[PDB]
Design an enzyme around this catalytic site. Structure first.
Site, mmCIF file in Angstrom:
data_model
loop_
_atom_site.group_PDB
_atom_site.id
_atom_site.type_symbol
_atom_site.label_atom_id
_atom_site.label_comp_id
_atom_site.label_asym_id
_atom_site.label_seq_id
_atom_site.Cartn_x
_atom_site.Cartn_y
_atom_site.Cartn_z
ATOM 1 C CB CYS A 1 1.318 1.271 -4.279
ATOM 2 S SG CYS A 1 2.319 2.842 -5.041
ATOM 3 C CB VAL B 1 -1.039 0.016 1.128
ATOM 4 C CG1 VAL B 1 -0.294 -0.198 2.613
ATOM 5 C CG2 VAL B 1 -1.676 1.181 1.301
ATOM 6 C CB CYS B 2 0.291 4.662 -1.430
ATOM 7 S SG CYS B 2 -0.241 3.958 -3.262
ATOM 8 N N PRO B 3 2.608 4.464 1.090
ATOM 9 C CG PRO B 3 4.794 4.093 1.554
ATOM 10 C CD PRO B 3 3.862 4.170 0.371
ATOM 11 C CB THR B 4 -0.237 8.289 0.831
ATOM 12 O OG1 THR B 4 -0.241 7.789 -0.510
ATOM 13 C CG2 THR B 4 -0.711 9.808 0.620
#
Lengths: 163, 166, 165, 165, 165, 167, 167, 166, 163, 165
Positions: free
Chosen positions: E165, D45-48
């Site tokens: 992602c 998942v994106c570390p956004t």
């Protein structure tokens, strides 16, 4: 689990080099201890494991390490066996009798339905902390040499924390 | 004690050769298994132990023995550490991630103060019975060669019961 | 008291004339049994009591009485003691090993702080009922002759019930 | 819920700008703290969320706020993930490792089924009192700026009690 | 926390556009629901949060969402407060009365000390699963629009599972 | 069994040679004691065991051994039995009455479904330790000569520890 | 007290006119019974209460009333006592022995620290119901004539219910 | 039962003549008190009962008797209802709000299914002892006049103990 | 609390108009019941409360309402009192004796340390539901008229749910 | 049994010769007491037993014996019964009321399903020890004369202890 825990108090009779003595946890304080449990004296299995530890006894004493073999037989049985088996006759360390099973249950090492201890070895440091544990089923031998190694390693770590 | 007892059911995610798989006691039934627990991925400790098992994996597979390394790190962490360390990259056996600690506790091998498993190895036969245990404190090393010897011995007695002494 | 109670089920390994056998309460059904407890094999005291019983063994078997000596040592220990001691070598009855202490606890004859059984003898009839009990401290010998007398007397009673006087 | 209760004591290892440090309730006394819980390092998942917080970090440090990201991964893992990720490399705040899961549990934020913490952000004042809580399921994002607004208000209400209409 | 768990059944009285109705878990099945908890009617604090939600109400009803404000006040009180307040009069959604406090407790949102619910908003999907939670202390406002963003995302992630992602 | 344990405190009335006395554990301290339990007085069974112990009472006393017979009958019954039986008339040692069954239960010797003590003999040394126990079913008799041998062996071992035959 | 309750089942041995019989609750069904408890046989107290009940045994029997004396002594003791006492020799009703104290405890009549029953008399009707209870301390005697009056009054009330004097 | 028992400690917010005050058992000590519980504010039920007590409040105050109406509604709700209903506006005595239900439960008067108190009145003397209780189901009315009579009677016996019958 | 709960089963003897009868919960099924508890018969307090209920008995019977006075005295005592007191002699409803205290404990109305019931009145509908409860300390009288009122009101509500 | 046990503390109201008094175990200390239990006042059976005891009252007081009749009716009931019955009117001893049943239960003399005491008489010595007990069913009268006889006999025993025969 027992790893990194302090051994419990105990009082047992033993046969050592021709004499009956008493061993307690207090006799281990300040020293490196090896508790070598085995099932029974006088069976038909090769006494290999005990003889090999004996061969390394010379060296273990040099490292400040005491060896205590333990079975649920009485100290009387150990004496007799020490005279019947040429392999066992090499033993100069203490052979503890544990007829009540208390020492064995201390290390949670009892085959409850047999009344005999499992094949287990424990390495205990001067402070009573178990640093190494080894248990095997019947027929799967314990290597004396590997025990020595683990002990030297156990000693290094005690004098060189982290690396 | 655990010696001579049957392993307990379990269900974990693992990293094995580039992909993610699921391991359960189901995969161990009918096979010989080695559960190799260790404290943690990406630590300044020398991964020598895992690499050494890797070195004997081929002979292990040849003898019908599977190997599962276990840590409380997630299987994602194992992927990363595998494509990061030259020594860990040599590993072709499953690397189980046990973040619930369940697998680790089934073997009564948790360091409850750290949430990390102790350094322990277990040999499990095809019927799920533990035949060999080994636990050491940090810094005390396990000899993969010694492990191999015991496994052969364990396999020998399964085949030759009651081998009296000559 | 255990007097007049029925023995409990048990399953132990024993050493009998060079062979290892298994003994259970089934083996006592229909027969007269003597459970002879003693503390330990290979100590320093002489096995007089066990030997005294061996001497009367032949006669006991005539009366249909089986004998089982019991101690918490293993049957392996018994085989070794049997071939290391002249007295023990005379023993033809079964030598039961009770490492778990279950047989000994069945007769409430365990010295818990020692893990050894007390010097107690139990006479059990064919229906499994204890008819005679004898226990003594170290040094006070159990006489095999008095044992024979009691057994014959117990056998008489079973044959001539409620005999007035 | 934990809203308006005092955080429980704790002691964890953390990674902060190339060095390992130890955080405890002590480091939060008399200080506005933000606890940012996330499930796992090296995921797909994106570390956004973490990086979006990283940005507003300077401003926060000004308002007298501290940021602590928390994951059940060890701190060793945090140092590593701060080298293989551009986003994570922007984190100047403390990245706490919670392998025992004690910190997560103090906040009742543990997915007992997975051994991973849920996506929750907490706002703790200098007295150790939780003023704002935010929990969202895997995929629903946490607005970095909105969190800031919450801090502003939380801070105002802290200064100007009772703001009747 | 309750994040990602199924709401517990319930039955409460509510006020909705001049009429008393009964709401139950039934009315939420197969529907996106928003539970807006607030402390008390006729207080001195600004009804902003409730009215701010009132505004975005049309849009919500479009996305297939339902709004339920909940207070431990009876529904009789809600009808009254919807006549003496301009802001509250804008509420076209259901205003639930929770005098027994059961609904609030189902959501673990009760200030046991006061008998009033805390400031918490929940987002429940058609399956009855809580996807977003927001709790703030007396004074810190809940962004109506941010809640909307949360719904949008929650809804997307619902349609497009696993968005690597 | 009760082997090697100390007897418990007790207080009973007894019949000793035309007299009624009280007996307690204090009476046994510093002495060798024989507690001889039997089922009941005035029954049809031959009072053999009791007469036999009576015969050897001379010898026993020369060895410093006191004898106490015990049954759940009262002491009044013993005094009566002692006048109607020639055998029981030979008894000169104390005949303890145990109606509450406390003494009997102390030695774990009660037939609970009968309220009668079992046939049991206990040898207790000067420090109150039980050195020998014997219990038999009705009909199986107890040998007073074998009791004496045991008593003498118990005294010999007390006087000469670790002098047991060497293997 | 046990007033108005049904006696509990029991099984004891007894001495009845040179014989040993077994007595159970079945023996009392359909009959009027008097259970007469006393402490002990062969004691020094005058067996007055027992002789007095013996004297009226003729009358009692004419009324359909059975008598059972009970003590914790065994039946063997009763048979013996019946041969040495002139008073006890007059007894022709069954002398029950209660060594386990079960009968005694059934009537909640045991002196627990003595293993002896208290002086108590119970009147039990044909259906096994206790209609009259009397317990006295040692020295306070029980009047057999007052017992008979009670028994007759119990029978009269059974035969003629609600015929009690009107206020 | 509650008759003849001492009321329990409590701490609630109330609306009394335009302002908000705090009531505790402390305020009732040394005084005669009437706790008048009712189910709810702003309901289509006729507030007659509360107004009727209002009508006797002056004579009640003259006799040293305080009055506290109680409901599980907050004290804010009481303010509003007071400046909304012509009948409730006649109230000069404290209107306790009991949203935790604690005060209501101290008197074992909660309708656990509704979270509202039952229609009950309690008369408490200066030592805190309950001397009169009255509970009725919805729709059954309480007569303020009857309440007044009992209070006078309760005050009479406190002053004239053991009043035998002429 | 007892308000709006169902009365419990009970079996007691009573004196009613010269005769001893038995009363059970089954006798109340389908009717309106008034259970009027009081402390004791033959004391020195004015029998006022009981006499006033009697004066209204005529009317209560007309509304399908049964009256049961209850005290821990026996039904025998009620009979005697009914002959000694001119006020009590007016009673035509059942006077229940509750020597065991079970009926009283049913309505949780016992003064445990006195063995007497507290002055309590209960109004029970055909379904066994308590609709009205009134309890007072000694000296604080119960008004018969107010009881009547509550009962008529209790009846209205039963036939006109909500208004 | 209660024979030979010490009575228990009690505190009851009684009716004695026109007056109401309080009786407690203190009142029995040092004296001989008779507790005479009966089921109820004003039943239809004649008070013969109570009257029979009244007739011997004077003589009992000479022996220093106090009498307390007991029933679960109140002392008020006793006053009324006393002035309504010729027999009861003859009573000069104290009539205890036991509405709580405590006195009756102290003597284990309660018919629990009736709330009335059984027809039991207890003779208590100066040290508070029960020396005689008598209980009978309805219809079997307790004879006051036999009662006097027992008391004199109990008094004799206390004066001439352990009198052989």
């Amino acid at each position: 689990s027992l790893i990194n825990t302090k051994i419990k108090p105990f009082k047992n009779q033993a046969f050592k080099n021709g004499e009956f003595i008493e061993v307690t946890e207090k006799d281990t304080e300040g020293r490196w201890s090896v508790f070598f449990f085995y099932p029974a004296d006088f069976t038909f299995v090769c006494p290999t494991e005990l003889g090999d530890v004996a061969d390394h006894y010379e060296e273990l004493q040099k490292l400040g390490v005491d060896v205590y073999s333990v079975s649920t037989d009485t100290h009387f049985i150990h004496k007799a066996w020490h005279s019947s088996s040429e392999t066992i006759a090499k033993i100069k360390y203490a052979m503890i009798g544990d007829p009540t099973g208390a020492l064995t249950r201390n290390f949670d090492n009892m085959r409850e339905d047999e009344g005999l201890a499992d094949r287990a070895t424990f390495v205990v440091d001067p402070q009573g902390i178990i640093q190494a544990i080894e248990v095997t089923a019947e027929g799967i031998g314990r290597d004396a040499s590997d025990l020595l190694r683990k002990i030297k390693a156990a000693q290094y770590v005690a004098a060189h924390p982290g690396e």
